[PDB]
Ligand binder design. Structure first.
Ligand SMILES: [Ca+2]
Ligand SMILES: [Cl-]
Ligand SMILES: [Mg+2]
Length: 301
Protein backbone atom coordinates (compact mmCIF):
# COMPACT_ATOMS: atom_id res chain seq x y z
CA UNK A 1 0.00 0.00 0.00
CA UNK A 2 1.03 3.59 -0.80
CA UNK A 3 1.63 5.87 2.20
CA UNK A 4 1.99 9.63 2.69
CA UNK A 5 4.06 11.14 5.57
CA UNK A 6 1.58 12.14 8.34
CA UNK A 7 -0.47 8.95 7.84
CA UNK A 8 -1.28 6.61 10.70
CA UNK A 9 -0.84 2.87 11.36
CA UNK A 10 -3.25 1.29 13.87
CA UNK A 11 -3.89 -2.21 15.31
CA UNK A 12 -4.79 -4.21 18.44
CA UNK A 13 -2.59 -6.88 20.05
CA UNK A 14 -3.05 -9.73 22.55
CA UNK A 15 -0.27 -12.34 22.56
CA UNK A 16 -1.70 -14.86 25.05
CA UNK A 17 -3.33 -13.21 28.09
CA UNK A 18 -0.08 -13.74 30.03
CA UNK A 19 1.45 -11.67 32.81
CA UNK A 20 4.49 -13.95 32.57
CA UNK A 21 7.33 -12.83 30.30
CA UNK A 22 9.08 -14.87 27.63
CA UNK A 23 12.31 -13.98 25.84
CA UNK A 24 11.64 -16.81 23.37
CA UNK A 25 9.52 -14.93 20.82
CA UNK A 26 8.36 -11.30 20.88
CA UNK A 27 6.17 -9.84 18.12
CA UNK A 28 8.29 -7.67 15.81
CA UNK A 29 6.41 -5.03 13.84
CA UNK A 30 8.52 -4.63 10.71
CA UNK A 31 8.10 -2.97 7.32
CA UNK A 32 9.20 -3.65 3.74
CA UNK A 33 9.82 -1.06 1.03
CA UNK A 34 11.08 -3.61 -1.53
CA UNK A 35 7.95 -5.67 -0.70
CA UNK A 36 9.32 -8.99 0.65
CA UNK A 37 13.07 -9.60 1.00
CA UNK A 38 14.26 -6.77 3.29
CA UNK A 39 12.78 -6.06 6.74
CA UNK A 40 13.37 -3.15 9.15
CA UNK A 41 11.49 -2.33 12.38
CA UNK A 42 8.80 0.37 11.96
CA UNK A 43 10.52 2.13 14.85
CA UNK A 44 14.09 1.18 15.79
CA UNK A 45 13.66 3.33 18.87
CA UNK A 46 14.92 6.84 19.48
CA UNK A 47 16.99 6.57 22.67
CA UNK A 48 19.07 9.00 24.84
CA UNK A 49 22.31 7.53 23.39
CA UNK A 50 21.05 7.28 19.76
CA UNK A 51 22.63 9.54 17.11
CA UNK A 52 21.72 8.43 13.57
CA UNK A 53 19.01 9.69 11.21
CA UNK A 54 15.50 10.52 12.45
CA UNK A 55 16.86 10.79 16.02
CA UNK A 56 19.42 13.61 16.30
CA UNK A 57 19.93 16.89 18.19
CA UNK A 58 17.03 18.93 19.56
CA UNK A 59 14.32 17.71 17.14
CA UNK A 60 14.32 14.10 18.44
CA UNK A 61 11.23 12.47 19.97
CA UNK A 62 12.40 9.73 22.35
CA UNK A 63 10.49 6.62 21.37
CA UNK A 64 10.10 2.87 21.92
CA UNK A 65 10.90 0.26 19.28
CA UNK A 66 7.98 -1.51 17.59
CA UNK A 67 8.89 -4.76 19.38
CA UNK A 68 6.24 -6.42 21.55
CA UNK A 69 7.32 -8.82 24.33
CA UNK A 70 5.05 -11.65 25.50
CA UNK A 71 3.83 -10.81 29.01
CA UNK A 72 3.55 -7.05 28.42
CA UNK A 73 0.29 -7.68 26.51
CA UNK A 74 -2.17 -9.19 29.01
CA UNK A 75 -5.30 -7.52 27.59
CA UNK A 76 -6.08 -6.07 24.15
CA UNK A 77 -3.83 -3.08 23.50
CA UNK A 78 -4.31 -0.55 20.67
CA UNK A 79 -1.07 0.66 19.09
CA UNK A 80 -1.13 3.88 17.04
CA UNK A 81 1.94 4.97 15.07
CA UNK A 82 2.35 8.27 13.23
CA UNK A 83 4.13 7.31 9.98
CA UNK A 84 7.37 9.35 9.92
CA UNK A 85 8.81 11.23 6.91
CA UNK A 86 11.80 8.89 7.30
CA UNK A 87 9.76 5.95 5.86
CA UNK A 88 7.10 7.61 3.67
CA UNK A 89 8.99 6.22 0.65
CA UNK A 90 7.31 3.62 -1.61
CA UNK A 91 4.43 1.14 -1.22
CA UNK A 92 5.06 -0.42 2.18
CA UNK A 93 4.32 -3.95 3.33
CA UNK A 94 4.01 -4.57 7.06
CA UNK A 95 4.96 -7.71 8.97
CA UNK A 96 3.94 -8.99 12.38
CA UNK A 97 6.43 -11.79 13.10
CA UNK A 98 6.74 -13.94 16.21
CA UNK A 99 9.54 -16.44 15.29
CA UNK A 100 5.23 -19.53 22.14
CA UNK A 101 1.56 -18.42 22.30
CA UNK A 102 0.09 -17.21 18.97
CA UNK A 103 -0.46 -13.45 18.84
CA UNK A 104 -3.96 -12.10 18.28
CA UNK A 105 -4.13 -9.12 15.95
CA UNK A 106 -7.24 -7.04 15.11
CA UNK A 107 -8.42 -3.74 13.62
CA UNK A 108 -5.53 -3.14 11.24
CA UNK A 109 -6.27 0.39 9.98
CA UNK A 110 -3.99 2.49 7.78
CA UNK A 111 -5.35 5.98 7.05
CA UNK A 112 -4.61 9.63 6.25
CA UNK A 113 -4.34 11.84 9.37
CA UNK A 114 -7.63 12.16 11.24
CA UNK A 115 -8.57 15.43 12.93
CA UNK A 116 -6.18 15.61 15.92
CA UNK A 117 -5.52 11.85 15.52
CA UNK A 118 -8.88 11.16 17.20
CA UNK A 119 -7.13 12.54 20.31
CA UNK A 120 -5.98 8.97 20.99
CA UNK A 121 -9.58 7.98 21.74
CA UNK A 122 -10.84 6.35 18.55
CA UNK A 123 -10.00 4.41 15.43
CA UNK A 124 -8.97 6.48 12.44
CA UNK A 125 -10.65 4.90 9.39
CA UNK A 126 -9.99 6.56 6.01
CA UNK A 127 -9.48 10.02 7.51
CA UNK A 128 -12.19 10.43 10.14
CA UNK A 129 -12.77 9.13 13.68
CA UNK A 130 -14.60 6.15 15.17
CA UNK A 131 -14.65 6.92 18.88
CA UNK A 132 -14.39 4.16 21.50
CA UNK A 133 -16.81 3.74 24.46
CA UNK A 134 -17.02 6.78 26.77
CA UNK A 135 -16.13 9.24 24.01
CA UNK A 136 -18.10 11.04 21.33
CA UNK A 137 -17.25 12.71 18.03
CA UNK A 138 -16.76 16.46 18.46
CA UNK A 139 -15.00 18.96 16.15
CA UNK A 140 -13.61 16.12 14.00
CA UNK A 141 -11.98 14.29 16.92
CA UNK A 142 -13.00 12.20 19.96
CA UNK A 143 -13.78 13.98 23.25
CA UNK A 144 -14.53 12.44 26.65
CA UNK A 145 -18.21 12.10 27.68
CA UNK A 146 -17.13 13.39 31.10
CA UNK A 147 -14.36 15.73 32.25
CA UNK A 148 -11.03 14.21 33.29
CA UNK A 149 -9.54 13.88 36.75
CA UNK A 150 -7.06 16.59 37.63
CA UNK A 151 -4.92 15.85 40.64
CA UNK A 152 -3.19 12.59 41.47
CA UNK A 153 -1.17 11.23 44.35
CA UNK A 154 0.10 7.69 44.82
CA UNK A 155 2.28 6.61 47.75
CA UNK A 156 2.43 2.99 46.53
CA UNK A 157 1.42 1.41 49.84
CA UNK A 158 -1.17 -0.98 48.43
CA UNK A 159 -3.67 -0.68 45.62
CA UNK A 160 -2.39 1.43 42.70
CA UNK A 161 -4.18 4.66 41.89
CA UNK A 162 -7.03 4.10 39.40
CA UNK A 163 -5.48 7.09 37.56
CA UNK A 164 -2.68 4.83 36.25
CA UNK A 165 -3.70 3.88 32.75
CA UNK A 166 -1.17 1.07 32.42
CA UNK A 167 1.87 -0.04 34.40
CA UNK A 168 4.11 -2.26 32.31
CA UNK A 169 7.01 -4.25 33.80
CA UNK A 170 6.48 -3.00 37.35
CA UNK A 171 4.41 -3.39 40.53
CA UNK A 172 4.24 -2.20 44.10
CA UNK A 173 7.44 -3.51 45.73
CA UNK A 174 10.70 -2.87 47.58
CA UNK A 175 13.50 -4.09 45.23
CA UNK A 176 15.45 -0.80 45.31
CA UNK A 177 14.86 -0.37 49.05
CA UNK A 178 13.12 2.59 50.65
CA UNK A 179 12.72 5.74 48.54
CA UNK A 180 10.62 8.17 50.60
CA UNK A 181 8.73 5.71 52.77
CA UNK A 182 7.18 2.27 52.77
CA UNK A 183 6.74 0.47 49.46
CA UNK A 184 7.40 1.98 46.00
CA UNK A 185 6.37 1.39 42.39
CA UNK A 186 9.23 -0.97 41.48
CA UNK A 187 10.28 -1.89 37.90
CA UNK A 188 12.01 -5.23 37.23
CA UNK A 189 10.16 -6.38 34.10
CA UNK A 190 12.18 -8.00 31.33
CA UNK A 191 10.42 -6.22 28.45
CA UNK A 192 9.13 -2.65 28.57
CA UNK A 193 9.13 -0.74 31.86
CA UNK A 194 6.64 2.16 31.83
CA UNK A 195 4.24 3.89 34.22
CA UNK A 196 1.59 5.79 32.27
CA UNK A 197 -1.32 7.90 33.60
CA UNK A 198 -4.82 8.36 32.17
CA UNK A 199 -5.35 11.74 30.52
CA UNK A 200 -5.70 14.43 33.17
CA UNK A 201 -7.07 17.97 33.16
CA UNK A 202 -3.82 19.88 33.71
CA UNK A 203 -5.13 23.40 32.90
CA UNK A 204 -4.62 24.36 36.55
CA UNK A 205 -1.87 21.83 37.42
CA UNK A 206 1.48 23.38 38.29
CA UNK A 207 3.64 20.58 39.67
CA UNK A 208 4.61 17.04 38.79
CA UNK A 209 6.64 15.66 41.70
CA UNK A 210 7.99 12.15 42.49
CA UNK A 211 10.89 10.36 44.17
CA UNK A 212 13.14 8.29 41.89
CA UNK A 213 15.93 5.75 42.20
CA UNK A 214 17.65 4.09 39.23
CA UNK A 215 19.89 1.19 40.29
CA UNK A 216 22.05 1.03 43.39
CA UNK A 217 25.71 0.82 44.41
CA UNK A 218 24.91 -1.60 47.24
CA UNK A 219 21.39 -3.10 47.18
CA UNK A 220 22.27 -6.23 45.16
CA UNK A 221 20.64 -8.17 42.32
CA UNK A 222 17.16 -6.61 42.66
CA UNK A 223 18.66 -3.12 42.02
CA UNK A 224 21.88 -3.47 40.04
CA UNK A 225 24.19 -0.63 38.99
CA UNK A 226 23.37 0.98 35.63
CA UNK A 227 25.99 0.49 32.88
CA UNK A 228 24.70 2.31 29.79
CA UNK A 229 23.08 5.72 29.14
CA UNK A 230 19.89 4.16 27.71
CA UNK A 231 19.14 2.83 31.20
CA UNK A 232 18.25 6.36 32.32
CA UNK A 233 14.60 7.44 32.41
CA UNK A 234 12.49 9.70 30.26
CA UNK A 235 9.49 11.57 31.74
CA UNK A 236 7.09 12.70 29.02
CA UNK A 237 3.64 14.23 28.47
CA UNK A 238 1.10 13.57 25.72
CA UNK A 239 -1.90 15.68 24.64
CA UNK A 240 -3.36 12.83 22.54
CA UNK A 241 -3.47 9.84 24.91
CA UNK A 242 -0.06 8.46 23.95
CA UNK A 243 0.23 8.88 20.18
CA UNK A 244 2.80 11.68 20.51
CA UNK A 245 4.99 12.12 23.62
CA UNK A 246 6.90 15.31 24.46
CA UNK A 247 9.89 15.59 26.78
CA UNK A 248 9.39 16.83 30.32
CA UNK A 249 12.61 15.64 31.95
CA UNK A 250 15.39 13.19 31.14
CA UNK A 251 16.88 11.57 34.23
CA UNK A 252 20.54 10.61 33.95
CA UNK A 253 21.47 6.91 34.33
CA UNK A 254 24.18 7.52 36.97
CA UNK A 255 22.60 10.34 39.00
CA UNK A 256 19.96 8.37 40.94
CA UNK A 257 21.90 5.58 42.76
CA UNK A 258 20.26 6.90 45.97
CA UNK A 259 16.64 8.19 46.15
CA UNK A 260 16.06 11.79 45.01
CA UNK A 261 13.03 14.05 44.75
CA UNK A 262 12.22 15.63 41.34
CA UNK A 263 9.88 18.64 41.06
CA UNK A 264 8.83 19.67 37.54
CA UNK A 265 7.08 23.02 36.81
CA UNK A 266 4.76 22.24 33.87
CA UNK A 267 5.24 24.14 30.59
CA UNK A 268 2.16 25.87 29.01
CA UNK A 269 1.93 23.24 26.28
CA UNK A 270 1.33 20.46 28.85
CA UNK A 271 -1.74 22.25 30.32
CA UNK A 272 -4.83 20.99 28.53
CA UNK A 273 -8.14 19.30 29.42
CA UNK A 274 -6.55 15.91 28.52
CA UNK A 275 -2.76 15.50 29.15
CA UNK A 276 -1.30 12.10 30.13
CA UNK A 277 2.12 11.54 31.73
CA UNK A 278 4.65 8.66 31.53
CA UNK A 279 7.90 7.46 33.08
CA UNK A 280 9.74 5.11 30.68
CA UNK A 281 13.21 3.44 30.61
CA UNK A 282 14.36 3.24 26.93
CA UNK A 283 16.59 0.12 27.11
CA UNK A 284 14.88 -3.32 27.24
CA UNK A 285 14.38 -4.52 30.84
CA UNK A 286 16.37 -7.77 30.41
CA UNK A 287 19.72 -5.92 30.43
CA UNK A 288 18.72 -2.84 32.46
CA UNK A 289 19.06 -1.65 36.07
CA UNK A 290 15.80 -1.78 37.99
CA UNK A 291 14.24 1.48 39.15
CA UNK A 292 11.42 2.73 41.36
CA UNK A 293 9.13 5.73 41.94
CA UNK A 294 7.61 6.94 45.22
CA UNK A 295 4.98 9.58 46.08
CA UNK A 296 3.94 10.55 42.56
CA UNK A 297 2.10 13.84 42.97
CA UNK A 298 0.32 15.78 40.23
CA UNK A 299 -0.93 18.91 41.97
CA UNK A 300 -2.46 22.39 41.56
CA UNK A 301 0.05 23.42 44.29
CA1 LIG B 1 5.69 4.78 49.47
CL1 LIG C 1 17.18 16.03 36.81
MG1 LIG D 1 21.81 12.66 29.45
Amino acid sequence: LTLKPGYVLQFKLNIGCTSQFSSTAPVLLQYSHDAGMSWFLVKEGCFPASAGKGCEGNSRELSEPTVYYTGDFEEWTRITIAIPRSLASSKTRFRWIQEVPPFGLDGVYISEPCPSYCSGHGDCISGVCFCDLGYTAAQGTCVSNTPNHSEMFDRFEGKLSPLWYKITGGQVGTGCGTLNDGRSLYFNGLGKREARTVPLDTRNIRLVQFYIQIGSKTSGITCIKPRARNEGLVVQYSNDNGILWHLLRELDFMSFLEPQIISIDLPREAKTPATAFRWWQPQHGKHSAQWALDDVLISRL
